Every structure is written in structure tokens, then in C-alpha cells.
Structure 1
Amino acid sequence: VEPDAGKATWVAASTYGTDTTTGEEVKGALKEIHFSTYKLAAKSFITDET
């Protein structure tokens, strides 16, 4: 599962040259979410007399 924002830092416009800041954001970070399974079980019996 992905993450969102993502904050781009505005630049006052004194300079030219590129000369571009970018808020130093992680290019590819993701989150694993993992699932697990439980088991319900029962037993019954029948005696050889009833």
C-alpha cells in the first residue's frame, strides 16, 4: 500500500540556472500489510449403543 503527500517547496523566483529545490521526498517507499489465518475446529462422537 502506497503513501500520499508529498510536499513541494515553493521558490521565491530571484534565481535562474535550475536551481530547483524539491522538498527532498522519498522516491519509492511502500508499506506491506500482512494477513494471517486461524482455524476453528470441533469434534463430536457417537457411542455404539444409542
Structure 2
Amino acid sequence: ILTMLVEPDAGRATWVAASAYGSDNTTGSEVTGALTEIHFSTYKLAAKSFI
């Protein structure tokens, strides 16, 4: 196997209200993401002959 890393999709920000300009919500929201993987393999092809 040969395994590679796949970047995730997109997140998004939040529109904070005017009230939270001094409160803790001024920072907005937390955005997370997780990576993923892909795998590859091979197959065998063969033939024989006689003389």
C-alpha cells in the first residue's frame, strides 16, 4: 500500500452581533477539520509458454 493525505473541505466564519463587541463572542467561532487518506494497490498479470 501507498497511502496519501487528503486535505478536508472548507469551513466558514460567523457574523458576530454588535452586542458581543465586548463579550467573549467577539472572537467568533472555532473552525475544525480532519484529514483523510487514500490507498493504492497492484495486481499480478502473468503468462507462460513451452517449447
TM-score normalised to structure 2 length: 0.66
Name the structure with the higher strand share. Answer: 2
User: Greater helix share, 1 or 2?
Assistant: 2
- Structure with higher Rg: it is 1
- Name the Cα RMSD after superposition: 1.7
The percent identity for this pair of structures is: 73
Higher relative contact order (CA 8 A, sep 6+): 2
Aligned length: 44
Q: Which consecutive segments of 4 or more residues in structure 1 shift more than 4 A?
A: none
Q: Which runs of 5+ in 2 are unaligned?
A: 1-5
**In 2, distance between residues paired with 1:11 and 1:36?**
48
